[PDB]
């Protein structure tokens, strides 16, 4: 469900 | 110099599938973080986000229309496809199709967004 | 879904007022990365949408500073503080952190008369 982001 | 371009058929019936193109350039989806994607706006009507992929073939798409989409890449002719399956009346809008990368230097955001092109569904 | 509630749908304002805009989340948008990847768009008619904020407050590459976003979580806000003709357009908040994408309805910037 999350989009994907670099942390 | 960075551009998007959307190509499409402009007119096709009901229950046909539409493909749809998009040229990039003054940039690849190759490189690392990368990703292009598809959103679309019937006339006069909202923005509904429809499917993004990345650079390593990682592909996201909306639940609503999930048996009807099918993003698809092509790495050194620099292009990314769209296909709607079963299309219909409703599925009648511009298609933009957009740069994001998912990493904070590239530009995690929707900057960079082509002039569009319009697809009507109508028998 | 994580739907984006505008309000107004429409904003009639004169040229040269403070104009505000919300935007409400149904739920948290706070990636575990740690931001908050809530956008701010225009569109102008005849063109595509352009980037104004991203990550709540944080304004986009020569978007003047009368354009500024607030705002944590679920609430959140657009102003502008001295409306001219060209801010006017729709306005739609985005969030990017839950998939699908979404983006609100769209608050048209209209002048009053």
């Known amino acids: 469900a999350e989009f994907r982001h670099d942390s | 110099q960075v551009t998007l371009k959307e190509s499409g058929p402009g007119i096709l019936k009901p229950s046909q599938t539409l493909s749809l193109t998009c040229s990039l350039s003054?940039?690849?989806?190759?490189?690392?973080?990368?990703?292009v994607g598809w959103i679309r706006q019937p006339s006069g009507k909202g923005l509904e986000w429809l499917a993004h992929?990345?650079?390593?073939?990682?592909?996201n798409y909306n639940p609503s229309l999930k048996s009807q989409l099918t993003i698809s890449k092509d790495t050194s002719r620099n292009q990314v496809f769209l296909k709607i399956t079963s299309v219909d009346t409703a599925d009648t809008a511009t298609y933009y199709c957009?740069?994001?990368?998912?990493?904070?230097?590239?530009?995690?955001?929707?900057?960079?967004w082509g002039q569009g092109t319009l697809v009507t569904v109508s028998a | 879904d994580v739907l984006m509630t505008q309000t107004p749908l429409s904003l009639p304002v004169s040229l040269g007022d403070q104009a505000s805009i919300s935007c409400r989340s149904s739920?948290?948008?706070?990636?575990?990365?740690?931001?908050?990847?809530l956008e701010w768009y225009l569109q102008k008619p005849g063109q595509s949408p352009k980037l104004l904020i991203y990550?709540?407050?944080n304004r986009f590459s020569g978007v003047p500073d009368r354009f500024s976003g607030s705002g944590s979580g679920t609430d959140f806000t657009l102003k502008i503080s001295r409306v001219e003709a060209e801010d006017l357009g729709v306005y739609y908040c985005?969030?990017?952190?839950?998939?699908?994408?979404?983006f609100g309805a769209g608050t048209k910037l209209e002048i009053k008369r």
């Open positions: 990550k709540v407050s």
């Open positions: 739920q948290s948008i706070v990636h575990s990365n740690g931001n908050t990847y």
């Open positions: 985005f969030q990017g952190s839950h998939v699908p994408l979404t």
């Open positions: 003054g940039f690849s989806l190759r490189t690392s973080g990368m990703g």
């Open positions: 957009v740069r994001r990368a998912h990493n904070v230097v590239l530009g995690d955001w929707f900057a960079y």
């Open positions: 992929i990345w650079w390593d073939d990682d592909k």
